[PDB]
Every structure is written in C-alpha cells, then in structure tokens.
Ligand binder design. Structure first.
Ligand SMILES: *[C@H](NC[C@@H]1CC[C@@H](N)[C@@H](O[C@H]2[C@H](O)[C@@H](O[C@H]3OC[C@](C)(O)[C@H](NC)[C@H]3O)[C@H](N)C[C@@H]2N)O1)c1c(COP(=O)(O)O)cnc(C)c1O
Ligand SMILES: CN[C@@H]1[C@@H](O)[C@@H](O[C@@H]2[C@@H](O)[C@H](O[C@H]3O[C@@H](CNCc4c(COP(=O)(O)O)cnc(C)c4O)CC[C@H]3N)[C@@H](N)C[C@H]2N)OC[C@]1(C)O
Ligand SMILES: [Cl-]
Ligand SMILES: [Cl-]
Ligand SMILES: [Cl-]
Ligand SMILES: [Cl-]
Lengths: 445, 446
C-alpha cells in the first residue's frame, strides 16, 4: 500500500489526525537499520529523532537484537515468577554503574517510572508534597506540574527550574516535601545548577530525584547523574533497551524498599526480553571509544547546522550535549518549515528542535543530513523571505527567556511578575486547608 | 548456574521487593517455559495455573506468536520515527471487525495505562468531571481508591461496588456530571444480565459505559464479556492480548477515541510494533476452529476435578465462573493458600488468589498432573491444619459468600441498613460538595 492508502485506512480505525498524521512528516516507516529508515514506497531517510528518543545505538542493533531474540526463542518472555536471572543481572549491572543506585525496580514506560518514583518517595518519607520541574509524563498531575504553582488535588508544586523559588519553598514548607523531581535541562543551565539543587534538597532531608527518561543516555553515557550530580533517585527510560519498552527507577535503598507498602505493581514489569536487551545496551555503551564517536557525530551535525543558519544570516543558538542538542530559532514557524522541507531530501529532523544522533551514525549519514538542511533552509528563505530575520543578528535575550518559559516552563527572569508568582505560590501552600490532601497510598490522612 | 537461594540473596541486595517478589510467592524462580509447563533454576517442572499472572492465554513460547514477534524485531524493526505502522493498522482493522463497540482502537503498554486512558478520553469527550467505578483498574491511587465504595473529591471518582441500586441513584442525582462508568466485570457473583442493566442505565443518562476487560478480555469468552453480548462504549484489553508481550488496547466509540488529540495523551512506546504483530497472531489462533473450545474443556476438567477433591474431603467450597477463569472459594482465606503452597512441592503453580487460569496449550495430561498434586496437597493440609480445614461438609454460609465479595472485589451485595445508609451518605457527599474544588483535568474544565 502507499502512504495515502495507509492513512485512509488508519483514519477509519486508529489514527489521531494531528498526533499520528497531519502533525508528522507524510511517510510511514516499513523497516530501518543503523541510521537509515525506509518508507512504504522505498524512499530512504536518515533519522534524527531517535525514534522519539527510544533509540540510542541505532535501528536493529545486531547485538541487542541477538540478545532479545535469544531470550524470546530459548527461554520465554513473561513467567509466573517476577524475578528472573536477567532481571537480577541487569539490576546488579546498574547498581555497580551508578552512584545513586542501591536498588533498582523496572517498569514499561517513563510516565509510569516517574509516577513510581513519586509514589515511592511519598511512601518512604510519609510526606505529602512534591516539587517538580520539567516534563515527567502524560498524567494530569505530571502535566500540571510543568507549570509554576501548586495543585492541592495532586500535591504537586511546579517550581519552573527557579532556584530562588526552590530555596524559598523548602524553607517555608520543606518538612511537608516528600521529594523534588527534575528533568535536567542542560542548554539553559550547567551541571552546577543541579548540584546546587541537590545539595539544597539534602540540607532539608528531602529526596532529590532526577527524571532522566530523556537525558539518561544523551547528556552522557551515565546521564546527568553520571556527570557528577548527586541524587537519591534516577529514572531512566528512553534508550535503556534501545527501542524496546523498559524503564528503571534506581536509588536509595529505603526509597526503593517502599515498594511493598506503596502498592505498586503491574503485570508486565517482569517482562524478561527487554532486560536482556538493556544488558546488551550497557555493554555497547561501555565499549572503548563508542560513545565518544557518537558525540563526535553529534558535534559534526550541530556545528554544520549552526554554520548553515549563520550563513543565511538567521539569528540562532545551537547548544547542549552532542547527543541532544537544541536548535533555537527566532520564532516557532521557521524551524517547522525547514524540517518539513528537509523530509523531501531524505531526512527526519526532530521538529521540536532537539536533534538526536545515534551510535550507528557515520560521517556520511551526518553529511547527508547537512546537505538536506542546507538545501531546505535555502528553499524556505527563497520562497518566504520574511519567515525570519536574515540580517546576521543574534537571538535576543527576550527570545531566549521567552523560549525557556514556553518550551519547558523555565522561569529565568528576576522580575516583578516572577517574584510575585513565587510569593503567591508559597502563600497558597502555607495557608491551605490542611484537612484536604490528595488520595495517597499509604494514606497520610 | 545460580540456584534459588543464590538468586533471592542477589535479588534482595539489588532489586527485590521482599514481600511482592520473594516471600509472598512460591520458593522457585522460572528459568524457561513452554506450553503449559515451566522449569525452575534447578530443572524442576511445574504446570502453570497462573497464566503468568494472566499475561499468557495461548501458552508459553507459542510458535505462531514467537514467529510473529521475532520476525518483526529481526527483519523490520521495533519502534520507528513514525507512529503509524502496517501492523498497527492491520491490528486495528482486525479489532474493529471483531468487536461491536470498536469503531476505533488505540494502543498502550499496560492495562493500568489503558484504563487511565479510557477515563481521560471519556472526560475529554464529554467535558464532565466524575467517573463511577467498580473493580480493580490498576495501581494508581485513584484506581485503587475507586475499588472502595465512596467518593474521593481529589480524584473525581465514585466507587459504587457493583451495586445497581447505587448506580441508578447516583446517575439520577448527579449523572449530568458523570463522564463515564468503568467496570471490571465480575462474573462469579453476577451474570451478564447484571452488566446489561448497568449499560442500559448509563445509556438512559447519556453516560459512556466502559468495560475494563484487562483481565476478562480473553477468559470470560474469546471476545470477552463484551462479545458475550454486553453493549459498551469503550472496552479496555490487556492481559493475553499479545500472549505475554506487553500490549493493551482501548477500543470504542469514534467520538471518545477521537478525543486523543485534545486529551494530551502520548507515550512513546505506544507505537512499538512487535507486540502488535504478536496480537495479530493471537487473534488468528483464537479464531482457529476448536482452539478456544479445547481450552474451555480443559478448564472444566480442572474445575470439576478440584471441586470433587475438596468435596471428597468434606471441605465446603464453591467452584464456579467461566472455564478459563474459575474461582475456588473456601470457608476461610487461609486454607486455599496453604494447599497451594503445598502443591508447589508436587509440581504445580496454582493461582494463590484462587482464580485458576488454564491456557490453550493445556492437555489432559497437564490438567491431571495438577489434579493429582491438588489431591495430595489437600490431603496433607487437611491432616495438618484442623484450625483452617473443616471436614464436616455442607455449603459455604451466606455470610461467608457476602463477606468474600466485599473483601475480594469491593462488591456491596447486601440490601440492608448499613449498605443503604452508605449509598445515601455517598450521594449526599457528591451533591453537597464545594464545586470550586475539583481534580486537575486536561483539557481543563474549570
Ligand atoms: C491486571 N492487574 C494485575 C493485578 C494483580 C494480580 C492480577 N492477578 C490481578 O488480580 C486482580 C484480581 O483479578 C481481582 O479479582 C477479581 O477479579 C477477577 C475475578 C476472577 O473476577 C475475581 N472473582 C472473585 C475477583 O475478586 C482482585 N479484586 C484485584 C487483583 N489485583 O490484578 C489489571 C489491570 C492492570 O493491568 P497492568 O498494568 O498491565 O498490570 C487493570 N484492570 C484490570 C481489571 C486488571 O485485572
Ligand atoms: C530546550 N531543551 C529541551 C527541553 O525543552 C525539554 O523538551 C521536552 C521534550 O524533551 C519532551 O518530549 C520529547 O521526549 C518525549 C516525551 N517524553 C518522554 C519522557 C517521559 C515519559 O516517558 P514515556 O511514557 O515512555 O513516553 C518522562 N520524563 C521525561 C523527561 C520524558 O522526556 C517525546 C517528544 C519529545 N519531543 C516534551 N514532551 C516536552 C518538552 N518540554 O526537554 C528536552 C530538552 C532538550 O532539554
Ligand atoms: Cl510512506
Ligand atoms: Cl513465553
Ligand atoms: Cl512554569
Ligand atoms: Cl528455583
């Protein structure tokens, strides 16, 4: 069938029009290997989305696929017992690999992993409130926590990556805080920002939890945590089993050991093949030179993309880690037009602006993507000269601050509005009706 | 290479929940399995009656499922940059043909996420706040609290304990605020007509009726309770759908499923392809003439044999329910567990909660092996435990059956003063609440 035939069938039976069809490039992938994907009509594309970050090593990685198919064929997938040899071997590998990991438990998705981390922190501490920055998943309490402010029905206070807010909240009501959970943003902030958050949480005996579902294999081979940010819990997900569904919650023994009293559970958390896959992923990441070559390819792409935009006179900022770099533009229309056009030249850029190379990339794959980006940017500007400034200027500080707030809820200004919002939120928490709490297990109430 | 004692010690150090993973289950760990049989770390063999905690419907390492999943992984790929794939569309088309309620179908990784999705879509499609619930839907706090009769304002969930008198009164009192009714069908204490009456009440108040068939979907019948003839606006499937590979599905009325865009639901691994290939293979097996009928015959053989073993020892008992999910109810909550722990020694994993789950891979030899183990274990426990093993015959008391239903699944089956006052108290709590205080919803309703 071709694209048009498949989407007509999909519209009738399964597809969400925007999420599945009109918000995405007009192709459907049939197979993929290494850096390259092939659509239903045989057209080939370099992938820069990492399969929405699920893939770190490349498509159909041979050692990962050998390990997963061996488990499926020779032993089985999901057994009557919850422990298995691969689960224990993987847990041992992770506890040896990561400083925070004294025990580790597994789930299917990052959304459920961060929910489990919050559930365990509440059960281990007996406290009600959670302070949050960043995206943690699609449940309502997670999405609301991306916005600055307090939701009494969920027990979550969003703090917008704001250090002044975090310190003021912990001083005001830190005895009520079960945990601080943060998806580290490392374009606008350096590692010291997160070291200060962590040390500040420790001063108040509040667990600090890094949501590394996205950054865990892309800020570095051991994530932001492994770059030297102490934490009591780290959640991993994207990349862990190189596209197979697996998430992990690793951390302090007493937090993980709250599993029994928490009531957490789940039929498929014992599923064995993804655990075999993750063991193979760690073996690749720990092979001398492999991660460094991936970062070299990321730098080659980032440097070339920055050069292309600057040569067109387009204000831009290209930054962040090599395996998860952002391309920040003067407005939210230019990027989408370029990336849509680059699909015509054989590339799937990440249209949210964070480009994701994988370990299978070579210089030829990077340079194919750069050719498409140069040609697409040229065509877009030729056809729509007013789509963005072309005067050679820099991104304004106003655009950078506005982008941070719109993209990830970061409140980076020290102005009247931000200061008033901090005070309003702290007052709302401190003087609330304490008889009204979220539904919690165990109950606190 | 490592035995049970070594594995549990290594696990306690790095991963195990002491009760959930170790002390609360049989003292063996499964290394590999095929069909109805599992083998532990030391080579001992067991017939599985847990269905891998219901994940498995056909049997372990079923050749058609193994072929479909490995072919997709090996020859094409696992998760791609596009969310649509050929197997997703083919699976959606198969399910839309198979099920009356399925106009569209979306997929997720776990049944807990599937039922959460169903509620999110019902609220998004209707613009209404409250959900009425009966039965277990997953491990999130709002799901767990909804198993108890009553109202939690912070979640917007009212548990109604399977009670039709409560359901009708709630819909009359505040049905204009109800986005959906979500029920896990219990078919030991209730018949299909009970669920048809729930569905009819929901239809009269324009409230979506949603069947959580994460457990019952392939075990109440080959098309679940819905396929036996209970109308629904949404059905959630999960256990068995991909024969042990993680996959869940939310299928239902077009306008409810089409709330996906505005709801904010996402989740990356929802596009993962191999489990969808596996589910296509599962439907093909279930639709093969004789396969499901043979599985039900094996379940009847097991249930009939377990009933006569207990009755032969004079233990009052009730063995009933569908052949692929029958309950063994005893006079107290200790006796079954003690028999099942003892039966492990004789080469069976019985389901400790009492709902025994055969799979399509069962044959008479597997059933009879389990019955022989059950007969020996029952004899041993009866002899050793007169404190929990009455041998004086008779039936379960009416009080025991009523208490078991409330404890096991939150069913409020009594028509008495305490139950009626609880119904009225809960309705007054909902109706008289501070309407300015409500759960966080997306899309927002405040
Ligand atoms: C699947 N959720 C898994 C949990 C844990 C263990 C599993 N065996 C299952 O057990 C539930 C029992 O099934 C249930 O018993 C009641 O329902 C079945 C039956 C035969 O009708 C019984 N008759 C007396 C009745 O008591 C217990 N009340 C509750 C137990 N937890 O549930 C699941 C999900 C989550 O899927 P996932 O995230 O993939 O694990 C969501 N919804 C449902 C309906 C189920 O079963
Ligand atoms: C400017 N710098 C940016 C910065 O703006 C910021 O951008 C993020 C995006 O990254 C994020 O989504 C990106 O990842 C996916 C979804 N989340 C998985 C996920 C899950 C649940 O896991 P599961 O249930 O298995 O899906 C849990 N926790 C985390 C941390 C997860 O990432 C798919 C879509 C893809 N675009 C957006 N959803 C929001 C947007 N604010 O963060 C990255 C950055 C580079 O720092
Ligand atoms: Cl295509
Ligand atoms: Cl299997
Ligand atoms: Cl914010
Ligand atoms: Cl063992």
């Amino acid at each position: 069938m071709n694209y048009r035939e498949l989407i007509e069938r999909a519209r009738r039976t399964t597809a969400a029009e925007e999420y599945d069809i009109s918000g995405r490039y007009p192709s459907v992938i049939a197979h993929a290997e290494g850096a390259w994907m092939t659509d239903l009509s045989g057209n080939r594309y370099v992938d820069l989305t990492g399969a929405d970050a699920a893939v770190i090593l490349g498509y159909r990685h041979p050692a990962v696929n050998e390990a997963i198919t061996r488990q499926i064929r020779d032993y089985g997938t999901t057994f009557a017992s919850t422990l298995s040899v691969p689960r224990v071997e993987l847990a041992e590998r992770m506890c040896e690999r990561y400083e925070c990991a004294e025990k580790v438990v597994f789930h299917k998705t990052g959304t459920e992993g961060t929910a489990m981390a919050v559930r365990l922190a509440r059960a281990a501490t007996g406290r009600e409130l959670v302070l949050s920055s960043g995206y943690h998943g699609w449940h309502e309490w997670q999405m609301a926590g991306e916005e600055f402010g307090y939701q009494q029905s969920t027990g979550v206070v969003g703090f917008g990556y704001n250090e002044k807010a975090l310190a003021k909240m912990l001083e005001a009501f830190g005895e009520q805080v079960a945990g601080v959970i943060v998806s580290p943003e490392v374009l606008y902030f350096d590692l010291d920002h997160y070291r200060r958050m962590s040390a500040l949480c420790a001063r108040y005996d509040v667990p600090f939890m890094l949501d590394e579902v996205y950054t865990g294999f892309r800020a570095g081979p051991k994530g932001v945590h492994g770059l030297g940010v102490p934490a009591d819990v780290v959640v991993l997900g994207k990349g862990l089993a190189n596209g197979h569904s697996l998430a992990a919650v690793m951390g302090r023994r007493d937090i993980i050991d709250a599993y029994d009293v928490s009531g957490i559970q789940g039929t498929y958390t014992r599923e064995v093949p993804p655990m075999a896959a993750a063991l193979a992923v760690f073996e690749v990441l720990d092979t001398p030179g492999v991660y460094e070559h991936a970062e070299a390819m990321g730098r080659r792409l980032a440097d070339g993309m920055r050069e292309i935009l600057t040569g067109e006179g387009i204000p831009n900022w290209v930054g962040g880690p090599a395996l998860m770099f952002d391309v920040v533009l003067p407005n939210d229309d230019l990027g989408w037009e370029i990336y849509k056009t680059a699909h015509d030249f054989g590339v799937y850029f990440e249209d949210s602006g964070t480009q994701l190379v994988t370990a299978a990339f070579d210089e030829a794959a990077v340079d194919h993507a750069l050719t498409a980006f140069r040609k697409a940017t040229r065509q877009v500007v030729a056809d729509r000269p007013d789509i963005a400034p072309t005067s050679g200027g820099e991104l304004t500080e106003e655009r950078k601050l506005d982008f941070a707030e719109e993209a990830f809820g970061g409140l980076l200004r020290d102005d009247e509005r931000t200061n008033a919002l901090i005070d309003e939120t702290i007052e709302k928490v401190v003087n609330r009706d304490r008889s009204i709490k979220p539904v919690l297990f165990p109950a606190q109430n």
